[PDB]
Amino acid sequence: AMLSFERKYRVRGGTLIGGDLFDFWVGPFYVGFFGVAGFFFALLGVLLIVWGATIGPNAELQTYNIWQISIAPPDLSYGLGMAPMTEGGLWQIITICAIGAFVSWALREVEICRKLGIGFHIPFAFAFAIGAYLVLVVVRPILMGAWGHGFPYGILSHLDWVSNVGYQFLHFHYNPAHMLAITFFFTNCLALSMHGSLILSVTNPQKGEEVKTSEHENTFFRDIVGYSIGALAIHRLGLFLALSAVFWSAVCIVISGPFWTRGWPEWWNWWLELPLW
């Protein structure tokens, strides 16, 4: 079922691949070629994860507990080759399916953008999240030389991976790109709360008042911090902050081990050893 204003937008065409073959909607979803590919990439990957949970690390430890299900990457001894299915090969197949699903999702978004005649900012922004995932499971494992460097597929198990990778550098907070990425993450959250607040407070003002104006919006933050970025620019800023956070997060992890093996605080010794002090 479509929105009450949607029918006049359900136009034929705008596909990247497939033309009229898959150019249709299933319920609310647009399918297209990459809807078919993406759905069955996701369906296979999800089913393989369930199968990976069905056999578990072994029969004794096997669990369907949603927190404890974990599909682990191969051992590092397998290098960049393919591992047996029960020894990390399933993880490698799921990773391929995940890449297939994520990219197909982005390309399906491109076809939707073409149908609606809008900018391609959303698929472009989604590519940053995909790029971060690709860095974690492809770029970094290849730079290190083994698929086993990828994180396991498990709701809690991949937190143990993050924890131990962080402590492979003894104090991960000192990673400079990590510090930059967190600053962008924290600033983005602050900017999002500010933007959500301003729009809501202007369109839902005090009782007995009419809807406010864009003049009120500029004045409000000028009255608080002396500057207003503007109605258009806050969306530029929000996109910039979120994308910079992910870009620098991708940088921080890809330099942690491939381009830096020491403890992260030791990296700052370049500044401490400047001859000025």
Partner 1 sequence: PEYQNIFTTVQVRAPAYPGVPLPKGSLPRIGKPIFSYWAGKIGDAQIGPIYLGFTGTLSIIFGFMAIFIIGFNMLASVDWNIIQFVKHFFWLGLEPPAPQYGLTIPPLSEGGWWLMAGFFLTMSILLWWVRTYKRAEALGMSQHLSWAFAAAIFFYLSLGFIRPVMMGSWAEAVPFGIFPHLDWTAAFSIRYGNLYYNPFHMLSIAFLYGSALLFAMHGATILAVSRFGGDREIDQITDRGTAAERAAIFWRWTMGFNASMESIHRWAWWCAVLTVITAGIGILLTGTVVENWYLWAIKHGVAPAYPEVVTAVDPYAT
Partner 2 sequence: MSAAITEYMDVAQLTIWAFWFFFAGLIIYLRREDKREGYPLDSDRTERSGGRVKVVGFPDLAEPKTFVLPHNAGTVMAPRVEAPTSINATPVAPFPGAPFEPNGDPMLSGFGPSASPDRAKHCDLTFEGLPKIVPLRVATDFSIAERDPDPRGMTVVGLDGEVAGTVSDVWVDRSEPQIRYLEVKVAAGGKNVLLPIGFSRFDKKARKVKVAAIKAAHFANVPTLAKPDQITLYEEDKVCAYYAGGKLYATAERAGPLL
Partner 3 sequence: CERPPPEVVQKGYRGVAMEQNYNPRLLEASIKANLPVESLPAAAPGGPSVSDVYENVQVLKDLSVAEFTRTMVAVTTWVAPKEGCNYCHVPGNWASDDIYTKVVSRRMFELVRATNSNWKDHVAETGVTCYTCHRGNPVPKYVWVTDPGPNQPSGVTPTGQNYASSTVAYSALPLDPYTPFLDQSNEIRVIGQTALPAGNTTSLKQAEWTYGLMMQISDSLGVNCTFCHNSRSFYDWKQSTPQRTTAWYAIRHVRDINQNYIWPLNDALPASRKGPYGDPFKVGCMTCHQGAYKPLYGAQMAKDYPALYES
Ligand X SMILES: CCCCCCCCCCCCCCCCCC(=O)OC[C@H](COP(=O)([O-])OCC(O)COP(=O)([O-])OC[C@@H](COC(=O)CCCCCCCCCCCCCCCCC)OC(=O)CCCCCCCCCCCCCCCCC)OC(=O)CCCCCCCCCCCCCCCCC
Ligand Y SMILES: CCCCCCCCCCCCO[C@@H]1O[C@H](CO)[C@@H](O[C@H]2O[C@H](CO)[C@@H](O)[C@H](O)[C@H]2O)[C@H](O)[C@H]1O
Ligand Z SMILES: CCCCCC/C=C\CCCCCCCCCC(=O)O[C@H](COC(=O)CCCCCCCCCCCCCCC)COP(=O)(O)OC[C@@H](O)CO
Ligand U SMILES: CC(C)=CCC/C(C)=C/CC/C(C)=C/CC/C(C)=C/CC/C(C)=C/CC/C(C)=C\CC/C(C)=C/CC/C(C)=C/CC1=C(C)C(=O)c2ccccc2C1=O
Q: Which of the listed partners (ligand Z, partner 3, partner 2, none) does 227 bind, with a CB threshold of 5 to 8 Å by partner kind? A: ligand Z
Give the DSSP letter string of 129-143. HHHHHHIIIIIHHHH
Identify the H or E element spanning 30: strand 29-30
Indicate whether 42 belongs to the interface with ligand BPH (CB under 6 A).
yes
Our CB check for partner 3 shows the closer of 83 and 110 to be: 83
Check the annotation: does 178 bind a ligand.
yes
In the complex, minimum distance from the CB of residue 1 to ligand X, in angstroms, rounded to a whole number: 4
Stretch that binds ligand Y, among 5-13, 50-58, 76-84, 107-115 (CB under 6 A): 76-84
Our CB check for ligand BPH shows the closer of 40 and 260 to be: 40
Identify the residue among 112, 114, 126, 201 touching partner 2 (CB under 8 A).
114
State the Cα–Cα distance between residues 259 and 131, nearest whole angstrom: 18
* Amino acid at the residue 151: F
Q: Which of the listed partners (partner 3, ligand Y, ligand X, none) does 95 bind, with a CB threshold of 5 to 8 Å by partner kind? A: ligand Y
Identify the H or E element spanning 93: helix 89-116
Q: Which two tokens stand for residue 4?
A: 């009450």
Indicate whether 212 belongs to the interface with partner 2 (CB under 8 A).
yes
Three-state SS for 14?
coil
Check the annotation: does 171 bind a ligand.
no
Indicate whether 57 belongs to the interface with partner 1 (CB under 8 A).
yes
Contacting residues toward ligand X, per CB under 6 A: 1, 26-28
Indicate whether 220 belongs to the interface with partner 2 (CB under 8 A).
no
Determine whether 88 is exposed, middle or buried from the number of CB atoms within 10 Å of its CB (0-12, 13-18, 19+). buried
Give me the residue label for tokens 């699903």.
Answer: 101
* Amino acid at the residue 233: A
Binding residues: 158, 178, 195, 221, 235
